[PDB]
Amino acid sequence: CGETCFTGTCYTNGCTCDPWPVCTRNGLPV
After folding, report:
1. CB–CB of 14/7 below 8 Å?
2. Residues β-bridged to residue 5
3. In b/e form, how buried is each residue of 3-25, taking b as 16+ CB within 10 angstroms?
4. Are 14 and 8 in contact (CB under 8 A)?
5. How many CA atoms lie within 13 A of 18 on its CB side?
6. How many CA atoms lie within 13 A of 11 on its CB side?
7. Which residues contact 15 (CB under 8 A, 6 or more apart)?
């Protein structure tokens, strides 16, 4: 994703705060 989710929330869609503080796009930290 490239984005970070220190708040446990992604700012960009298609990503989830799985590997905090980083977002996972389709299960990948891209």
Report:
1. no
2. none
3. eebeeeebeeeebebeeeebbbb
4. no
5. 11
6. 8
7. 1, 3, 5, 23, 24, 25
